[PDB]
Amino acid sequence: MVLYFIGLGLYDERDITVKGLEIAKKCDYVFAEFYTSLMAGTTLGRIQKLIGKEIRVLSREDVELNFENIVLPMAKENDVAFLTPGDPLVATTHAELRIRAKRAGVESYVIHAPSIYSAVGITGLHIYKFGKSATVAYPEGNWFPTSYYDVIKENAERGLHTLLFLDIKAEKRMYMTANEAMELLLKVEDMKKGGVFTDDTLVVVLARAGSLNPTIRAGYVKDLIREDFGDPPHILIVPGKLHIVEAEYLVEIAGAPREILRVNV
Template identity: 40%
Template structure:
């Protein structure tokens, strides 16, 4: 082996470098160095354990590199250029897809870590349908605060065309901004899964969401049971399965956080059939409407002979615009909530279970004053 290397060196010294390199490319694999340089990029797309990839690569390099190295040092004119190219290629190993929570209130609620990442990313997308941006967080305010453009991603982009968001995330840093916490919606968990299946590194930057900020009403977080979503009733479509989950929590003495329905960028059946991208105005279920639906369900269950867990005197908590400057919290009966105007969205409704004396004392500070129901 040593004799072979010395022979190559003497041959290289006795002829012009360009001729030697040309001869080498004809007789051997001319893509050897590009294999090395692009190795990190290729490795991110192969589903293989790291140790096995390193073992196979080392074996290949050991066999090929010993006698090809001299030739390619001539082509790249020394170690420095060769080494710099390889080190630069290693940057591909550190490209990441970021999911960044924005919090609840305004543009300044993003964490310092999240802000620094946003500023360095090549592309930044803004998820704009599992929460709202038209009240406290709009795209223009975010762009002004970040000092960079932001690409808005609607329901179709996130759920059906996620490859467009993830495109290039293996060779450049890409971020998706999410109001609240990234894992406050199952959609984002699915996006993380798709990224990992594509060999893309994922990093999540957490933030506050209604799931933990709900404690602002005085109810203790560890006493909450299953969270439910109350959907907006439509003509001929009035589901009530969420009531059973509320009843289950209530019977177990647990509090229930009810997330209220949001409908943005919805299409009528006619527009969908005609392929027209015409969308209905945004609609947000309010605490009042949710309370009315619950009372209707209670009435229907009573007519069937069931003993309803809730009634018009059940005490509930209404939350509006949590984390904003005009946040509002009201503690009242379900009947009172059904006619109460909590103002602009977003709203959440809480059905308390068994309460601790400290919880009761804090809830009483939000009790609805007399004659304040509209």
């Protein structure tokens, strides 16, 4: 009679919460989407095996245009689950789907899971110091998105860190690397010349958070722009003003140049 939004976590099927698993195991029908993010350490089959159910995967169009025609009708006679990578409501437009559920007279519940938004903590950067977040989107035809550059500028101006979600074209199986994001940013800098992102800018890369051995690297763009950070997904972070201990962690844990230990308070 109800609908469950259940997050599956960062990397593999075991990143789901115990609460999410027990409820999913008992749902009559299970739907899911895998276009809002990439869970690099698992497969649909493994997820199905864990939950013990068949999973009908939906495309962005199925969801955005037909959620109330495909999923909601099932929640009327049965308990339905809608699975998503990471946390279902983080950096997705899935929250609006709860409004659709309400309008169809369907109660909905949300089961959270680890999200890349909080996983940034593993970078050593104080999470309360992050400012506005942004997404580095692939240019399309003659359209070249640049707003994410202004976000960095605004945050850096305030000494705040900037989290940069990276683009994804699931149907093309394309996942933007931190390298590609850095190249795009350098191109925007050349254009706006704001001194926001250059070869000397310190950045942090977090790849495959959720895995036991994620890649966590910190350093100057000039040195990292061509470094191999491993398979996607990746996120790029442009730190603002660093606290001594943040710098220490970046150096000791993320292999940053010891020279960043010296902060210009």
